[PDB]
């Protein structure tokens, strides 16, 4: 029984520590109301299409029914008065956010042969290896933290969520991936998002280089002309 | 011991083949998005770095 | 004399750091001027592949 938080275009991907800094100070009244609790907590949802902050406090359908409840970490508030930390722990799909009744319907159906079902994730990370290799943004060490040879990945479904999080696709598409229940299907959509980034990336790098060699060739010509000039002006 | 190692090589290549093909089919089904969309992406890029 | 020698040393530190800050800054102002020139060139070339 808490008022819904205003995510305000802040995607909090599963199992990735993240910060939320809403501009409204009304939410802080709720954060202070929960500091007295022995087990303070906050939920994390995703916004639907056509974001409107006034509608988040007016209507409750704008927020997606999906919610990612998680325990609070630590307040900071270095500059703004509202710098909550959030993270993705207990995913939930509320039956009616307007109503909030909830159950942890964290489906994890699996094939009897649990040897090769994690193999598609390996192909996902190999695609991901091309993305971080040709366009490093974050350290590949996080990929090294969750490696397939190290045996620390106690929760592979969250690792597949973490890997789909690297895709740059908009949050409405993430909700489309969240609607998927079957593992190969959500992996299939997440793979489509991953390739969707990979062609456009590859195209950008090839274009950038392409323009560059044209510039080098342009230089080359200039130099050639310069040489000739000096050769016509010095000897003879 | 050799033959069991070969049959295991067969099983592993059939799995790598089926995964590589599963990725190649899904990739082909993502290439159905038109190259014009890529050119639209170029358009967006132009405006992104044109403010 | 020990304080005064330290003060001359700082005085050279002062003139030096001003010269270095100014030098890195002018150079980056050049780099920026070129970098934008490059970026604009790509803008052109994307417009040129499909104008």
UniProtKB/Swiss-Prot annotation, chain A:
It is found in: Mitochondrion matrix. Residues 2-198 form the Lon N-terminal domain. GO terms for biological process: cellular response to oxidative stress; chaperone-mediated protein complex assembly; mitochondrial DNA metabolic process; mitochondrial genome maintenance; mitochondrial protein catabolic process; mitochondrion organization; negative regulation of insulin receptor signaling pathway; oxidation-dependent protein catabolic process. Duodenum, heart, lung and liver, but not thymus. Keywords: ATP-binding, Cataract, Deafness, Disease variant, DNA-binding, Dwarfism, Hydrolase, Mitochondrion, Nucleotide-binding, Protease, Serine protease, Transit peptide. Its main location: mitochondrion. The keyword DNA-binding applies. GO terms for cellular component: cytosol; membrane; mitochondrial matrix; mitochondrial nucleoid; mitochondrion; nucleoplasm. GO terms for molecular function: ADP binding; ATP binding; ATP hydrolysis activity; ATP-dependent peptidase activity; DNA polymerase binding; G-quadruplex DNA binding; identical protein binding; insulin receptor substrate binding. The Lon N-terminal domains are crucial for the overall structure of the protein, maintaining it in a conformation allowing its proper functioning. The AP-domain (ATP-binding and proteolytic domains) has a closed-ring conformation in the presence of AMP-PNP and its N-terminal entry gate appears closed. Upon ADP binding, it switches to a lock-washer conformation and its N-terminal gate opens. Belongs to the peptidase S16 family. Homohexamer. Organized in a ring with a central cavity. The ATP-binding and proteolytic domains (AP-domain) form a hexameric chamber, while the N-terminal domain is arranged as a trimer of dimers. DNA and RNA binding is stimulated by substrate and inhibited by ATP binding. Interacts with TWNK and mitochondrial DNA polymerase subunit POLG. ATP-dependent serine protease that mediates the selective degradation of misfolded, unassembled or oxidatively damaged polypeptides as well as certain short-lived regulatory proteins in the mitochondrial matrix. Endogenous substrates include mitochondrial steroidogenic acute regulatory (StAR) protein, DELE1, helicase Twinkle (TWNK) and the large ribosomal subunit protein MRPL32/bL32m. MRPL32/bL32m is protected from degradation by LONP1 when it is bound to a nucleic acid (RNA), but TWNK is not. May also have a chaperone function in the assembly of inner membrane protein complexes. This is Lon protease homolog, mitochondrial. It comes from Homo sapiens. The gene is LONP1. The chain holds residues 123 to 408 of 959 of the full protein.
Swiss-Prot record, chains B, C:
Duodenum, heart, lung and liver, but not thymus. Belongs to the peptidase S16 family. The Lon N-terminal domains are crucial for the overall structure of the protein, maintaining it in a conformation allowing its proper functioning. ATP-dependent serine protease that mediates the selective degradation of misfolded, unassembled or oxidatively damaged polypeptides as well as certain short-lived regulatory proteins in the mitochondrial matrix. Endogenous substrates include mitochondrial steroidogenic acute regulatory (StAR) protein, DELE1, helicase Twinkle (TWNK) and the large ribosomal subunit protein MRPL32/bL32m. MRPL32/bL32m is protected from degradation by LONP1 when it is bound to a nucleic acid (RNA), but TWNK is not. May also have a chaperone function in the assembly of inner membrane protein complexes. It is linked to CODAS syndrome: A rare syndrome characterized by the combination of cerebral, ocular, dental, auricular, and skeletal features. These include developmental delay, craniofacial anomalies, cataracts, ptosis, median nasal groove, delayed tooth eruption, hearing loss, short stature, delayed epiphyseal ossification, metaphyseal hip dysplasia, and vertebral coronal clefts. Homohexamer. Organized in a ring with a central cavity. The ATP-binding and proteolytic domains (AP-domain) form a hexameric chamber, while the N-terminal domain is arranged as a trimer of dimers. DNA and RNA binding is stimulated by substrate and inhibited by ATP binding. Interacts with TWNK and mitochondrial DNA polymerase subunit POLG. This is Lon protease homolog, mitochondrial. It comes from Homo sapiens (Human). The gene is LONP1. The chain holds residues 358 to 408 of 959 of the full protein.
């Amino acid at each position: 029984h808490l008022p819904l938080i205003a995510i305000t275009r802040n995607p909090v991907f599963p199992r990735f520590i993240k910060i939320i800094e809403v501009k409204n100070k009304k939410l802080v009244e709720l954060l202070r109301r929960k500091v007295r609790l022995a087990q303070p907590y906050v939920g994390v949802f995703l916004k639907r299409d056509d974001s409107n902050e006034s509608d988040v406090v007016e209507s409750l359908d704008e927020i997606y029914h999906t919610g990612t409840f998680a325990q609070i970490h630590e307040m900071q508030d270095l500059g703004d008065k509202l710098r909550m930390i959030v993270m993705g722990h207990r995913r939930v799909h509320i039956s009616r956010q307007l109503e909030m009744v909830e159950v942890e319907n964290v489906v994890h159906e699996d094939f009897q042969v649990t040897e090769e079902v994690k193999a598609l994730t390996a192909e996902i990370v190999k695609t991901i290896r091309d993305i971080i290799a040709l366009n490093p943004l974050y350290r590949e060490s996080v990929l090294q933290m969750m490696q397939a040879g190290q045996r620390v990945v106690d929760n592979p479904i969250y690792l597949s969520d973490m890997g789909a999080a690297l895709t740059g696709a908009e949050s409405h598409e993430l909700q489309d991936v969240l609607e998927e229940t079957n593992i190969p299907k959500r992996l299939y959509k997440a793979l489509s998002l991953l390739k969707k980034e990979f062609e456009l990336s590859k195209l950008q790098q090839r274009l950038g280089r392409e323009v560059e060699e044209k510039i080098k060739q342009t230089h080359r010509k200039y130099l050639l002309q310069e040489q000739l000039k000096i050769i016509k002006k010095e000897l003879g």
